[model samples]
Target chain A: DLQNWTPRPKPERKIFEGRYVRLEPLNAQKHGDELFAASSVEDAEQRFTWLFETPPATRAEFEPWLDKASKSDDPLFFAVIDKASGKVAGRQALMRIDPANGVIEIGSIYWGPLISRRPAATEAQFLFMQYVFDVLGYRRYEWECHNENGPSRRAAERFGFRFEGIFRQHMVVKGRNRDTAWFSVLDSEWPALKQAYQAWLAPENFDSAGQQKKTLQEFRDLG
Target chain B: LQNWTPRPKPERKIFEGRYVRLEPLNAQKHGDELFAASSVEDAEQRFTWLFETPPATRAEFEPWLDKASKSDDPLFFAVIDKASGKVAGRQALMRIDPANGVIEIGSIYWGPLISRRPAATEAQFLFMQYVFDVLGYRRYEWECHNENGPSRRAAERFGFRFEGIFRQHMVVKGRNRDTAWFSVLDSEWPALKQAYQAWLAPENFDSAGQQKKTLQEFRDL
Candidate 1:
């Protein structure tokens, strides 16, 4: 049973600076052009296959979406900037906030191909989770995606979110049926996960090519 | 992918079934029956899983019923008996999400007089048909306190598939509550509706009001 329970605070528009990336409240004027160019790749269509909104054809089209999105308290959007290149490489959000229950979901992720496999993408997730648990003191962190989205599934498992179950016919996205796959990371498990993330981000854990020497699972098991 | 089409909200109107009838709740017509049921044998135990405390008097419950009768979200209904033409029990369609085409069956109260009867089960069948077939909902949800074993078993016995449990979901009666969720999707409704029809047939019951075949047998068919 939960004892001496207390509610966690809602997430605020705050910036977080990590080794490889920095998270800032989504600023359309500041990061629109850079993020649009980064995302306008050959496989841009595939990148947004499971996303609620389709890929914007031009910067002009994307700017309006960002303009409306930036003002929302829920699904508070954030731009994930690559510190090395000093450019906006991706975007994500802290959504479905349930501060009273200390529950929140990390979703609305859009990773550009240029930095999709880069360390900054993973670091951005790590930073977001750290803020969710460490700063906000939330009890649960959630991740959900369309059941057909295999890449998102692998990413969730790799990131240490426990696969819970599926909600059948949960949504009608782009006129296609979407069965949502659910996952969560409780605060009780965060200490071990935090250790693994910290160790995996260490300089020795990567080579000159910046490839991870030890897998996230290896570090988690070690922890 | 489903083509975009907005479904209409559930209409607050009378729904007639062969065994039972559902009427839009009115405090004047239904409050007396509800209050009478509340004063019956061991009502505290019956109301334990519910959010509402046992009503001390008819006056106390009338005000609440009046308020409940007017709420559009959890649109309430009174299940009427076919033989006696009197209200027997109450329930509601709540957490209405027409956008996602989802609705929940909740705030159920089947008093001693109504429990363990064909009419009770038939009310559920009628409601499911309206939510799925008539209203075109994709999901029909049923949730209950994890500790309420009878309600948990009822969900499965009535054909809702177990989804998952939300731990420490709420505080009720100044104590902890873990919610167990269940749902029946549109894809599974056709077969379940057939099962219900077969189970409710006059031939499925004996002249003495006993079931000729178990409800599960028809469901398995």
Candidate 2:
């Protein structure tokens, strides 16, 4: 029974060190230049197609945005540093945090070209999932996006979050209607998912070219 | 283009309707009627899907009524039947989000005095009118325990479109509560509001107080 249940701790700004990446509490001064450079790649604006803010065209425009983003407590931001490159490659955050119900959402994700489809991308997500589920002991970890955002939907399922349902007319974004699709991983199901994630991220699961021999679903199915 | 802007929060004022009026709830003014309504037969069953259990006595219900009457977030209102000149039940405007222009009608208890009566439906129509017309809200929401068939049907009957459900949304009274959500958008309101006006029109009811045409018939027309 949940009669004795209590609120879980809100996530603190700290380092989550993964083998391929490190998630640091966002510091604009420390990570701005590299972050700006990483975001300047061709077709970069596509990265922000569904996000609230448009992609900045120059470092001058990006710095102020990063400065403001670094200070928000609710959408507590983090800079993902690629260990191999020793530079900030992307950013993400824990947002819409509900400590009372032990629910949190991983959102505002901007995986720049440098981190996209790399081990660091997967590791960055894994670190946050591990921290939210194991460290802070949240009951539900959420992922939501525009219903038309197929890539995000696939990524959420790939990360083992189960599809919940869609909320029609959930928001009005960029002068268009946004129907939100939601997914979640419950704490009760986290153990098995974590095991699959662990097995998938293990060094032995990768080839010399850094490709996975078995997909995450394959590892999960092996159970 | 949405060209969206934040809307104003609902004011704590009275709303006048032909069948009923919504007055800002006050324990001193509405407590006795509300307490009496709570004691009516089958009243306890009405609270099965509500967050609170049925209060056993006036003494037990007083503190709750006092506290609820004072809450701003779930700003309470006493539904006063114009014909009876007495409180028929209570409801609230809750989860008020002005920035998103979203508001929910909840904490509703339509006592036997008004249940299945014009005052009950008028009470809801008044809330929708205030939310969409007065406050200029973009979305008027209705959510209930997923298992509440009556509430789900009521939502549809009131012109709210079913959005979907949120699983394991809350723990209410030590029981799991999966929430079913519905909404009426501003674009849909003008037509729905007309339907409400038509259905609540005096000519729509017979001298015996029976509805000559169902609300759906008016909407379908």
Candidate 3:
């Protein structure tokens, strides 16, 4: 029974320093130049295929978008900084926040080429998940992406989110029909998932080549 | 991609039907009849899937009844059984999104007096007609507690195609509720509407008020 249950607190805009990354509440001036440069290295349009908005091509175009994004509270953006290089590489957001129901979604992710396949990427995800479930005491942490976005679906499962059913014709994204695939980690299931993340992130889990011996799913299975 | 545009929200107006009429809820006219209808022995059972439980006494029901009469979002309506000329049940059009052209029919309470009657079926038909034919909505949705078998069956009976369940969707009355969702898109409405019209015709029913041909049979034809 939820007789004693009350609404949880909304996530606060604060810095989260992890082993490989720091999640700073987005500041355009502090992070924009590096972020834009990092994204420019790759085909920005292809890189942001699943995202809602098109990537601003010019530095002049990017500044205004970054400035507006830096201050938005609902889709509260975060700049992911690589601790080793001390440079911003990518961005993500905690969106569709429902404090009353203790549900929030980690979405609007744009992991630029510099951040992809790096330890900082994994840690950035973990930092937000940890804050959402452990710090804010949220009951359900959600992840959703376009049903056709295969990599995102795999990434959600890799991050230990159980697949929920798809919502067909859920939205019109960029004037195209978007069938959304939803996933979530309930509070009851968070502890074991957190343990998997912790074990996988440990220094001992990495070999001399700086590659993981046990995959995230393998660590989860060990438990 | 299908072209889309925002539709107008449904207005408060009387819907006249063969066996029933859906009147915008008014406390002065509907409150006493609704209260009397809900005061039946099995009235509590009628509210099993509804958000609010059966209000204990008439005094307690008045405030909520008054609130329902005035609320626009849910846009409550009293189901009037034509033969009896009284409020027999209540339903609402809720979660209205004009931009997406999506809407839901929910918070329905079919009192024992209206249960299994043609008025109950006609009441829903009238709403569906307005939602699709008049309002020009694309998606007409129906959702209920996953465990509520009667509601699930009713949705299918009313030509709502089953979508899927949303696990841990809500906490209602201090217990977890998984929701079963269903919808009728505008593309599928023409055939369904024809079936509904055929089944609701005077010739489809006997003098004793028994259906000569069931709704499903008419749809199958």
lDDT (0 to 1) per candidate? 0.86, 0.87, 0.86
TM-score: which candidate is best? 2
| Candidate 2 chain A weakest ten by summed lDDT | A167-176
Give the candidates in order of DockQ, highest first.
2, 1, 3
lDDT per residue for candidate 3 within A1-223, as digits (tens), equals 5766677898888999998889999998888998888666658888888898787788888888799899899899999888878888889999989887788999989887666877778889999999998899888888999999999999999999988777666666676777778888888889999999999999898899979889989999999
Return the interface RMSD of the candidates, in order shown, one decimal each.
2.7, 2.1, 2.1
Point out where model 1 deviates above 4 Å: A1-7, B2-4, B27-29, B57-67, B82-86, B167-178
* Preferred candidate (DockQ higher): 2 or 3: 2
Residue A89's lDDT within candidate 3 is 80
Native RMSD of candidate 1 (Å): 2.6
Model 1 interface DockQ: 0.45
lDDT of 1 at B39: 68
Superposed by TM-score, candidate 2 places the C-alpha of residue B152 at a distance from the truth, in angstroms, of 1.6
Candidate achieving the largest lDDT: 2
Which runs of model 2 end up more than 4 angstroms from their true locations?
B39-43, B56-67
Better of 1 and 2 by TM-score: 2
Question: Which segments of model 3 are wrong by more than 4 Å?
Answer: A32-41, A59-68
TM-score of each: 0.90, 0.91, 0.90
Clashing pairs in 2: none
